[PDB]
Write a protein that binds this ligand. Structure first.
Ligand SMILES: NS(=O)(=O)c1c(F)c(F)c(S(=O)(=O)CCO)c(NCc2ccccc2)c1F
Ligand SMILES: NS(=O)(=O)c1c(F)c(F)c(S(=O)(=O)CCO)c(NCc2ccccc2)c1F
Ligand SMILES: [Zn+2]
Length: 258
């Protein structure tokens, strides 16, 4: 009776196994755009993905993960709110059963169809596992997805999903360039938060881009054909794998623009 997204194990239940669910810096949050304050001291984010080396795509049960080589300093995220160098190691998405829901963060209560998370660990902690135990160990770049025109750079992800339909399946996924998932602008909001699902560690600097990307209905529809279950178990479509917005508590959201 493991955690998930259903009635019987979803977000309202997680605090029993993971009490930090009720912590002081949980994610996601609603981004109140009128209250987020431009911070002229923030830097223009540096997203350097030219040398990224994707490895594999894995159905982890609650999502799929695209994993990268994080054994040498390749793709990194720096600048903005960050002190030091964060190494890209994985991306994944959250999405809905319907185009009108799926994002974790919201913008003035608006929900997007999906949200892309590019996860990076702070190289000063040596490993991902070490980093995850630090309040500045991770930086996650969040990008909203709206349904409209297709995103060319997403299609290779969509097309491999039939090969990893069920929990525990993996496929080779080399030579994928995550630069094809980024919007034109790097304007962002930032705040201190957490992993958005168990174990909910309070280890993340969130950087949420203002500009969504456009994906087609057919692209998101293929995400909704994935399965939460393993092969040979009853089929449960992998949809609505988002945590709702959590209390902001003692935090300020800071804007890089305007
Ligand atoms: N796909 S991913 O690269 O984000 C990932 C996970 F999703 C994940 F769940 C884990 S896990 O080991 O915490 C639990 C397995 O479901 C690791 N672990 C990587 C790691 C651990 C210690 C030191 C360095 C890396 C992990 F790397
Ligand atoms: N949605 S999120 O970006 O905050 C997030 C999680 F919420 C999260 F729980 C994980 S996880 O691997 O701990 C559980 C399975 O997804 C990762 N994956 C990246 C990561 C891996 C290890 C430690 C910290 C983050 C993760 F990226
Ligand atoms: Zn996520």
């Amino acid at each position: 009776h493991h955690w998930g997204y259903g009635k019987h194990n979803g977000p309202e239940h997680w605090h029993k196994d993971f009490p930090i669910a009720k912590g002081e810096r949980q994610s996601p949050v609603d981004i109140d755009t009128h209250t987020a304050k431009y911070d002229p001291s923030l830097k223009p984010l540096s997203v350097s993905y030219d040398q990224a080396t994707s490895l594999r795509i894995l159905n982890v049960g609650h999502a799929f993960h695209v994993e990268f080589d994080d054994s040498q300093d390749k793709a990194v995220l720096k600048g903005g709110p960050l002190d030091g160098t964060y190494r890209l190691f994985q991306f994944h998405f959250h999405w809905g059963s319907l185009d009108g829901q799926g994002s974790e963060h919201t913008v003035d209560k608006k929900k997007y169809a999906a949200e892309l998370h590019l996860a990076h660990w702070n190289t000063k902690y040596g490993d991902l596992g070490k980093a995850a135990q630090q309040p500045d160990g991770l930086a996650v770049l969040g990008i909203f997805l709206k349904v409209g025109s297709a995103k060319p750079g997403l299609q290779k992800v969509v097309d491999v999903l039939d090969s990893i339909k069920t929990k525990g399946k993996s496929a080779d996924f080399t030579n994928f360039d995550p630069r094809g998932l980024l919007p034109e602008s790097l304007d962002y909001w930032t705040y201190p938060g957490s992993l958005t699902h168990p174990p909910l560690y309070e280890c993340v600097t969130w950087i949420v881009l203002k500009e969504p990307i456009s994906v087609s209905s057919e692209q998101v529809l293929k995400f909704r054909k994935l399965n939460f279950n393993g092969e040979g178990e009853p089929e449960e479509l992998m949809v609505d794998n988002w945590r709702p917005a959590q209390p902001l508590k003692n935090r300020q959201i800071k804007a890089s623009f305007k």
